[PDB]
Amino acid sequence: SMLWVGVVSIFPEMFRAISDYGITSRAVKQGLLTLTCWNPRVYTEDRHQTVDDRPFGGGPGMVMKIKPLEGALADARQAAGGRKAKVIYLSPQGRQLTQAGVRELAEEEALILIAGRYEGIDERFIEEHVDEEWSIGDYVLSGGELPAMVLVDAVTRLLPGALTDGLLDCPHYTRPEVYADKRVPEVLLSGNHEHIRRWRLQQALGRTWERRADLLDSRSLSGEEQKLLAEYIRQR
């Protein structure tokens, strides 16, 4: 198994969305990717022992207790075997996920994802056990299970046999050639690899320029790209 993922969450059954459907589901079946869950609720001491507890200094909500989390993590570590396991906390405070970050995480042999809820986990747990913190975007969600599934989905795509340049994609077209008085660009219907690849490159450069110009400030444009972009802008 290329990659081994352990998810630490109080809602293990939410993760059926990725284990039972899509490319992630396929990866589990193909033996390419191992996906396990570790509910911290079961690593408490008794039954009156809640996974969470009230926050110090008052305030609303609950905070996740260090001990259950430590139990779930130690267990997942053990199950990972001799694999080099990176521990990620899914957090709004984390480094924004980008395809570059996904490529970095894809190089890992084992990943242990911590998905906490709205009133978060105890700081000492993070300080002691977490390696990296990641956010999926600058918007507020009510927990880290959807961001954990987003991370697992993005990474799985890069696993060999499961299936970018800093540019948006070109438009896609499929049958019929004419639909509701709209025709597929002739270059795609009638054209050689060099026409199509230059057209695709120009549409990709053009759409990026139009919608996400910031992705161009970071990137340096080639001779062909600058020409194809100028040509696109002037032929709008």
Ligand X SMILES: CCCCCCCCNCc1ccc(CNC(=O)c2csc3nc[nH]c(=O)c23)cc1
Q: Which DSSP state fits 220?
A: -
Q: Measured from the CB of residue 82, what is the shortest distance to a second copy in angstroms?
A: 25
Residue type, 221: L
Segment 64 to 123, residues that bind a second copy, using CB under 8 A: 64-67, 92-99, 101-102, 119-123
The answer to the question of whether 184 is labelled as a binding residue is no
Stretch that binds ligand X, among 10-18, 32-40, 44-52, 117-125 (CB under 6 A): 117-125
Q: Which two tokens stand for residue 85?
A: 């396991």
Q: Cα Rg for the chain, rounded, in angstroms?
A: 23
**Among residues 82, 139, 194, 223, which is the contact residue for a second copy, using CB under 8 A?**
139
CB of 229 closer than 8 Å to CB of 206? yes
Number of residues that bind ligand X (CB under 6 A): 28
Backbone angles phi, psi at 190, to 5 degrees: -125, 95
Query: Is the dihedral angle over the CA atoms 34, 114, 74, 50 positive or is it negative?
Result: negative
The answer to the question of whether 229 is labelled as a binding residue is no
Q: Which two tokens stand for residue 127?
A: 């300080």
150 binds a second copy (CB under 8 A): yes
165 binds ligand X (CB under 6 A): yes
Q: Measured from the CB of residue 31, what is the shortest distance to a second copy in angstroms?
A: 18
Q: Which DSSP state fits 130?
A: -
Q: Which two tokens stand for residue 26?
A: 């396929």
135 binds ligand X (CB under 6 A): yes
- Of the two residues 71 and 206, which places its CB atom closer to ligand X in the complex? 206
Stretch that binds ligand X, among 28-36, 38-46, 70-78, 162-170 (CB under 6 A): 162-170
**Among residues 20, 104, 107, 231, which is the contact residue for a second copy, using CB under 8 A?**
20
Euclidean distance between CA atoms 212 and 14, whole angstroms: 33
Out of a second copy, ligand X, none, which partner does residue 57 contact, by CB within 5 to 8 A per kind? a second copy
Nearest CA to 106 out of 2, 35, 194 is that of 2
- Of the two residues 76 and 154, which places its CB atom closer to a second copy in the complex? 154
CB of 14 closer than 8 Å to CB of 115? no
Q: Measured from the CB of residue 137, what is the shortest distance to ligand X in angstroms?
A: 5
In the complex, which residues of this chain contact ligand X (CB under 6 A)? 90-92, 99, 116, 118-120, 135-144, 147, 164-165, 167-170, 200-201, 204
